[PDB]
A paper describes a structure:
The nuclear hormone receptor PPARγ is one of the three peroxisome proliferator-activated receptors (i.e., PPARγ/α/δ), that have been exploited as drug targets for combating multiple diseases, in particular metabolic syndrome-related disorders and cancer. Activation of the PPARs by natural ligands or by synthetic PPAR agonizts triggers the formation of heterodimers with members of the retinoid X receptor (RXR) family. Upon recruitment of specific cofactors, these heterodimers transactivate PPAR-responsive elements (PPREs) of target genes involved in insulin signaling, lipid and glucose metabolism, immune response, as well as cell cycle and differentiation. In order to proactively evaluate the deep interactome learning framework for protein structure-based drug design, potential new ligands targeting the binding site of the human peroxisome proliferator-activated receptor (PPAR) subtype gamma are generated.
To test the practical applicability and usefulness of the structure-based molecular design algorithm, the two top-scoring de novo generated designs (1 and 2) were chosen for chemical synthesis and subsequent biological characterization. Compound 1 exhibited the desired and predicted dual activity on PPARγ and PPARδ at half maximal effective concentration EC50(PPARγ) = 1.5 ± 0.2 μM, and EC50(PPARδ) = 0.24 ± 0.05 μM, respectively. Moreover, compound 1 was characterized for its affinity to the ligand binding domain of PPARγ by isothermal titration calorimetry (ITC), yielding a measured dissociation constant of KD=  0.8 ± 0.1 μM, and a molar ratio of one ligand per protein molecule. To investigate the binding pose of compound 1, X-ray structure determination of the ligand-protein complex with PPARγ was conducted (SI10). Compound 1 was bound to one of two protein molecules in the asymmetric unit. Compound 1 bound in the orthosteric site lined by helices H3 and H11. The buried propionic acid head group is engaged in four intermolecular hydrogen bridges. Three of them are established with the side chains of Tyr473, His323, and Ser289, whereas the fourth one is a water-mediated hydrogen bond with residue His449. In the empty PPARγ site, the carboxyl C-terminus of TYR477 is blocking the site by binding in a similar position as the propionic acid head of the ligand. The ligand’s tail moiety is exposed to the solvent, and the propylene glycol-like linker allows the ligand to enter the hydrophobic part of the binding pocket, where the two aromatic ring systems engage in additional interactions with the protein.
Numbering used by the authors: 203 to 264, 275 to 477
The structure:
Amino acid sequence: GLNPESADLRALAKHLYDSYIKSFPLTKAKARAILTGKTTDKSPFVIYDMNSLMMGEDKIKFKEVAIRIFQGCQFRSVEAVQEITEYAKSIPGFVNLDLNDQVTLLKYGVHEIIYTMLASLMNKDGVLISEGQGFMTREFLKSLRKPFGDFMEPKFEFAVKFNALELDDSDLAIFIAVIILSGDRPGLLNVKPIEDIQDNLLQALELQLKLNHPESSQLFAKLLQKMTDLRQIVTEHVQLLQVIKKTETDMSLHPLLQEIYKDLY
Ligand SMILES: Cc1nnc(-c2ccc(OCCCOc3ccc(CCC(=O)O)c(F)c3)c(F)c2)s1
């Protein structure tokens, strides 16, 4: 904030953080407080096997077991899409873009955002579910029958490496906006207005990380590099769905996810 240009970058960071808080009900700071046993929040019920999953169904409240779980992740993605869409609308310039490009930017951005923010709810042993009321172990997720036995592993591998960056919600707010305003999504009609916005967002992210993580060298670059991992998670998940739909012909797909995945990659 030391000159007027950089003060406007601060104002943009604060705007996005504010909108993020308003849009996403379970923040990283709340997730971390649940996972680490802090006294601001309530310990989760832990599901690590079939009997504890049965108990959990009664305690949390919220068909083979693998399919119920897989579909539960899809319902969560649909809620996430709703929240990401409302956040996207708050990004200055987004709603003024061509409507076709608004739709394309959401279509290709929402999963990258979902896996970014999924890391906030993960550690190397498992993941928060039902808004933090439950915690499902990574080993229980690995135990599910084929073809569902490894669908969570790439997301855990990503999370453990992403979490070592030690980003907070104020950082994440800007990073998620940068993800959405990507000028290289396929089929965009007007790239230039997108990149002008993305430029501003990147400038704000960069100053946010230098202020908030003054001791953490090239954090900005190391964060942008993680956009590689996110892309690979997505393309791998799409391949897995192609497999699942051949053996599991009785599995339905929420219409929002169907539209998103159509001709995605
Ligand atoms: C009985 C039960 N019924 N539901 C249960 C349940 C268990 C675990 C859940 O979440 C674990 C973390 C979310 O992980 C993700 C999220 C999104 C995707 C991508 C999905 C797509 O968009 O295609 C993903 F692949 C994994 C959960 F929400 C519900 S237990």
